[PDB]
Each structure stands twice: as structure tokens, then as C-alpha cells.
Design a protein around this ligand. Sequence first.
Ligand SMILES: CC#CC[C@@H](C)[C@H](O)/C=C/[C@@H]1[C@H]2C/C(=C/CCCC(=O)O)C[C@H]2C[C@H]1O
Length: 269
Amino acid sequence: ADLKAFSKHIYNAYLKNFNMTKKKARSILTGKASHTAPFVIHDIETLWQAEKGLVWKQLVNGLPPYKEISVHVFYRCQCTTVETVRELTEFAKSIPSFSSLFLNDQVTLLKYGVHEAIFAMLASIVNKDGLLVANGSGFVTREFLRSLRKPFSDIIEPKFEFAVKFNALELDDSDLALFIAAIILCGDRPGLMNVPRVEAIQDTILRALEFHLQANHPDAQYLFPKLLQKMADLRQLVTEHAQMMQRIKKTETETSLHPLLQEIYKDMY
Ligand SMILES: CC#CC[C@@H](C)[C@H](O)/C=C/[C@@H]1[C@H]2C/C(=C/CCCC(=O)O)C[C@H]2C[C@H]1O
């Protein structure tokens, strides 16, 4: 009922939009669902294998042209992000009263929120040693990712470090549903036209989040305040990311940038 039912509705919408969940992820990582472990991408050879059947099963990968391993992997990174971006924008449709905002504000919230939510959800498919890809059929090593040349390794690490530490909060999927909603309904995004409307919606989300957290984690006293502090850390993450992506565009001109991502980075901060 009410906050309880609100929390549940957002959760259901989450389940409907993201097919890889933390639950699934952990089930694979610990070896529970598995029998056969994920194929591991940890170098150039294995990355090649993974794309020809074991992880990605397409004859022609559909990626832009690349002349080196670092750029190739970065194209994979962009593909994942775009995937999650699409799911986020569809998930936002189930956020009560979101779709009724000015179109320009819907755009603004998502332009400035998807990366924060993606970075929060990243912890879900991560451990300290690497991360799941392609609905858990693949597993890419942290090590492999750190071996890419700058600026590509540099762009990846901070997110990796935030993801691993974020896991210390022990959130589950029904917690994450509300958290990502609260992320998207942020009132301080540059260029919002009707801040009070956006903030009233976020308020309803924040109320249910505090509600759900205490219901779902009775023993974790300061979970709510801790989660809210993560919002600031996510902001700093994306703020740095925008500078990194601007530098990619200026000093890695041979690196193709997905047009949806370009649209996001455009005039971003
Ligand atoms: C091979 C391989 C691999 C591992 C990846 C495919 C893994 O599947 C991707 C994980 C990426 C991380 C690395 C990032 C790079 C930023 C560039 C794009 C953006 O603007 O997001 C951002 C993180 C978000 C997540 O989608």
C-alpha cells in the first residue's frame, strides 16, 4: 500500500526493463546458476574468441573500424552503455508523472542522469576481479581493462573503483530500482525549466526509498543517508567523465563515438 506499493511498482518496472539484474549477476558469479562458468575475456585472443560465438555470436561485429586493442574494447564499452541508456529511458516512462513533464525536461533529466544510474548499476555485475558482459555469458577481467593504454584505462578505472566500493552497501534490485529513479529525478541538472515539478516527483521517490530501505534493511541504520551521499560521488564521477569524453573527442579523433553518446556529451557541463 502507498509507499509500499510505490516501491513495488518501481521495482516491477525495473525488472521489466533490465534483464541483467544484480540477483542474476551474483547467481552467476558465485557459480550457483551456472555449471558452466562465463567465458573469460582477459586478452586479445580471448576477446577474439568471445566475439566469434562464445560471448557475442555474430559473423560481423557491427563495431566501427579500429586499429588497436584499446579502441576496440572502448567500442565494446560504448555498446554496453548505449544498451543501458536505452533501458533507462524506457524505465523512466514508468516513473509516475515523469512523462508529463516538459519534453525538454525529460530530455535534460535523462541526458544528465543516465550515466549516474549506469555507474550505480555497474556495481551489480562487478567483483573486484572483473565484470560480467552479454547477460553473463562473458566475464572481462579488471586486469585486462587496466592494461589498455591511456586514456582508455584511465576512463574505466574510476567507475570500476566506485562500483566495487558501492557493493559494500549490500543493496539489492528492489533498492536499486528506487535509487536510480531518485537519480534521474534530480532537480539540479543544468537547464531544467520547471525545477519545482521535478523536485516534487523526486520527493515521492525519496520518501519511498527511505521507506523501502528501512523495510528491506532493518539492521542497516544509516543506509539512507549513505545512499544519498553516493549521489554526490556519482555527480563527481560523471562530471569527470564529461571531461574525459571531451578529451577523447579532441585527442583520439580516430576513435568513433556512438551518436547517441555524442548527443549526450553535447554541451554537457
Ligand atoms: C571487451 C569488454 C568489455 C567491458 C565492457 C564491454 C563493459 O561491458 C562496459 C562497462 C562500462 C564501463 C566502462 C565505461 C566506459 C565509458 C565509455 C562509454 C560511456 O560513456 O559510458 C563506462 C562504464 C559503464 C559501463 O557501461
